[PDB]
Design a protein around this ligand. Structure first.
Ligand SMILES: CSC[C@H]1O[C@@H](n2cnc3c(N)ncnc32)[C@H](O)[C@@H]1O
Ligand SMILES: CSC[C@H]1O[C@@H](n2cnc3c(N)ncnc32)[C@H](O)[C@@H]1O
Ligand SMILES: CSC[C@H]1O[C@@H](n2cnc3c(N)ncnc32)[C@H](O)[C@@H]1O
Lengths: 268, 268, 268
């Protein structure tokens, strides 16, 4: 049995996506999650929805409690976690409104805890050095790509996301530099969310939605405008993808993730 | 009416630049500024001078309260902020003693608050994502460039400043890497000073003074020696530029900056 | 007279390397060192051994008290500090099991104090801007290189170490990016250890041991396995190098390091 956690990004966190909804506030050894967990279903699959920035969007990227968010979903029984995120495009072919099923990342964050094993919590003892060669779940990404195709949506099969600290946008010199590094899209929330999911042994995948071309003219109003016009795409993709995930086998995949996570910890 | 704030860098903060001086200690919601504000005039223009590292240079770059400094100047009524900064040259044509009117930056800092909107101060509520495509005021930069020309000074019309955390200087491998990224000069204080000025709706410009060629032989004694020999240039440039700024129209420019700052904030 | 401090890395910290051993716990103005100092000798040379991650390896790279470790060694009278470190290879010619006598570094750390002069300790007052053009002691590196040759070991004469924050390993996009920057090997502990040693006026050198090819397949088990198989090399290199260092003159070298450190401090 699978249980899908869903973390909604800026203007991509509509609770009406689930049927038979029930609100539930929880606590974790790492503090409180961004907001209440919303329990429900999509067809016959159990899901858990969470707004990354809170229902009223009051939390900046640097202040999101990524540890609490991932821990709460893991504690609720989530085997998979599929998220949505607004991002800027660093490539001509990635047009605003396009979806990108990212497969790699480049870290540019500075003030964020990236591990549960900080030597100050009973629940996670020791030192953890988690592998990051393949940060996103290939099987989940494969289903997302095929589903976008069946839906006729403009979608890119791969892409490298550079995550900046924020909250400011990048300068033009930074924008051009990121392109030479191999980055394709840019945001402020992929890291450490993807890292902590891996430590928890969860299959993590991300639906990135391009909202602008950065500055290589971006502004809050421009970002919000593009999201309003295209949010239906991410909603349709999730509704159609989820039942598909719940109809296939994940025993072997989840076992391997559990092993990788367990054997990355160094005990005294 | 305009009021020019002036933030003086290492060995480039002489108070005798203003006439009719008056010392004034202030406080801000973000703490105390580096030192007392010095109120005075240059011809008929009102100015406010502030020493970035304190009068006795006792504050390292990482510890400067950039938030308090910018907030205090904004509170005093400053419409413009022109600063001075010592820097290393990463380009053969930028010789020690040369002035560079920078137009871009690359952030390499790690432990610095870059926004007033940290969700813990009544005066700045919400989440702010300020645009950084054009970090420095083009009109102010234009006047600085033309004035340097009238003064016959060696001056570069543009340049990208890479700001490192410090307090240590860069390694040789880092120095060469910065050059491949497109950086032209290097310092430890441009970021987040330029970012916070933008959030405040202030016209910000920077007078960078090359003091060495980094290491692609730099030392504290070498830096201080070059500054002593060339400080008169920055002083002459400011004295001649300021009356020029006070004789032109800034209503439309200040209005646009105010709009950009206001529309970058996301409210609950 | 010389006194060699030795900081042992992951699986490269065997105390049996010294004769006439005596355990000694100390304290510093910056807190407690990773573990007790082990006083002893190699032939006729006085040495001080310290385990970077503690005897039971319970401290992650981000949490190591680099300030306390370097301060404690300096306080004990150490003139030299030679360390061991496990690392990943970013170059085909650097094979797992090979030794690399590094000569440069690229900083990718974010949450680490890199100076003793933080303006909050009586023992180190003022602002220090230490030069980093040549981070490692050339004379000590020369002896290590010649000794490895006499021992017939596969050893590289130079190399650039990129130090990441950790504790996670790098993504594949990051791995490829580091190669384009000029990095040859990768670890999580060189910075700020090398920086603080320079501030203390100590001759610092590093014996890097390649344990894998990063991901341009790395895992904790793979790293530990390679170290177990090759640890004897680092031990033999240290035992043979140390008596050689104790037989040559260091007065002029130590004097120059002391001058560089003293003249990098800015007093009120
Ligand atoms: C609300 S505008 C910025 C927010 O949307 C995302 N974003 C959209 N476009 C960009 C961009 N060009 N650069 C960085 N983040 C972006 C970021 O993750 C942040 O949470
Ligand atoms: C006092 S020497 C270092 C100081 O001067 C500036 N500086 C001058 N040359 C350099 C350089 N090569 N690299 C970094 N900062 C430099 C920095 O902003 C710091 O405040
Ligand atoms: C125990 S595996 C990671 C530890 O060994 C070193 N290390 C070995 N291989 C690598 C690698 N590929 N990337 C980063 N650190 C590495 C790091 O400094 C850390 O303390």
């Amino acid at each position: 049995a699978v249980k899908i956690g869903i973390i909604g990004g800026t203007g991509l966190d509509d609770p009406e996506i689930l049927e038979g909804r029930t609100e539930k506030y929880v606590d974790t050894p790492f503090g409180k999650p961004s907001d209440a967990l919303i329990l429900g279903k999509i067809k016959n699959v159990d899901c858990v929805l969470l707004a990354r920035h809170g229902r009223q969007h009051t939390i900046m990227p640097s202040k999101v409690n990524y540890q609490a968010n991932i821990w709460a979903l893991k504690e609720e029984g989530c085997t998979h976690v599929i998220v949505t995120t607004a991002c800027g495009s660093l490539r001509e072919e990635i047009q605003p409104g396009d979806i990108v099923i990212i497969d790699q990342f480049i870290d540019r964050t500075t003030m964020r805890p990236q591990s549960f094993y900080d030597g100050s919590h009973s629940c996670a003892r020791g030192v953890c050095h988690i592998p990051m060669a393949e940060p996103f779940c290939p099987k989940t990404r494969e289903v997302l790509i095929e589903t976008a195709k069946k839906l006729g949506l403009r979608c890119h099969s791969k892409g490298t996301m550079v995550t900046i600290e924020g909250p400011r946008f990048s300068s033009r010199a930074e924008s051009f530099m990121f392109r030479t590094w191999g980055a394709d899209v840019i945001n402020m929330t992929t890291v450490p969310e993807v890292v902590l999911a891996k430590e928890a042994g969860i299959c993590y995948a991300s639906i990135a939605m391009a909202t602008d071309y950065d500055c290589w003219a971006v502004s809050v109003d421009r970002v919000l405008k593009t999201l309003k016009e295209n949010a239906n795409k991410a909603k349709s993709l999730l509704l159609t993808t989820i039942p598909q995930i719940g109809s296939t086998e994940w025993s072997e995949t989840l076992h391997n993730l559990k092993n990788m996570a367990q054997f990355s910890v160094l005990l005294p």
